């Protein structure tokens, strides 16, 4: 269930509400300002990392479950999304349907959205691909 949630359901949840559109109209306080803007942010693919931990001083190192248990840390992995930004502009005049066009300003784009805790021996944990003697090397029970 955790492998299904990480590998497939995370992507579906991101792609459900990926598009987010804010609309600004002409602000017809003067005749020079008749431009309508449309800003759309779209969340693309989601990437889940290996488990890690950031320290007080910003130092991030890969976290292993024995070290996580001893230091009272959280065995979690960061989640990134490829966000794409789109800005559209149009001439806002009455009696004409608005036609928005791209301004060719599309920056791309992993951004941190949160630490998802990782169930041990999932498809994401370190102990999954560990062999036997490797697993005693990490001070874990086989």
């Amino acid at each position: 269930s955790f492998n299904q949630f990480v590998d497939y359901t995370l992507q579906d949840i991101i792609c459900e509400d990926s598009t987010l559109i804010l609309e600004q109209l002409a602000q017809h306080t003067t005749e020079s300002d008749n431009i309508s803007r449309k800003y759309e942010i779209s969340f693309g693919k989601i990437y889940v990392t290996k488990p890690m931990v950031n320290e007080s001083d910003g130092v991030t190192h890969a976290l292993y479950p024995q070290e996580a248990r001893l230091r009272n840390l959280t065995y979690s992995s960061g989640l990134f999304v490829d966000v794409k930004k789109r800005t559209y502009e149009a001439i806002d005049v009455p009696g004409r349907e608005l036609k928005y066009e791209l301004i060719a300003e599309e920056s791309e784009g992993k951004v941190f959205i949160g630490r998802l805790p990782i169930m041990l021996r999932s498809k994401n944990c370190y102990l999954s691909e560990a062999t036997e003697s490797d697993l005693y090397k990490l001070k874990e029970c086989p």
Partner: peptide
């Protein structure tokens, strides 16, 4: 008297 920002579903 306008609404400035608005939500587009």
């Amino acid at each position: 008297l306008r609404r400035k920002t608005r939500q587009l579903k």
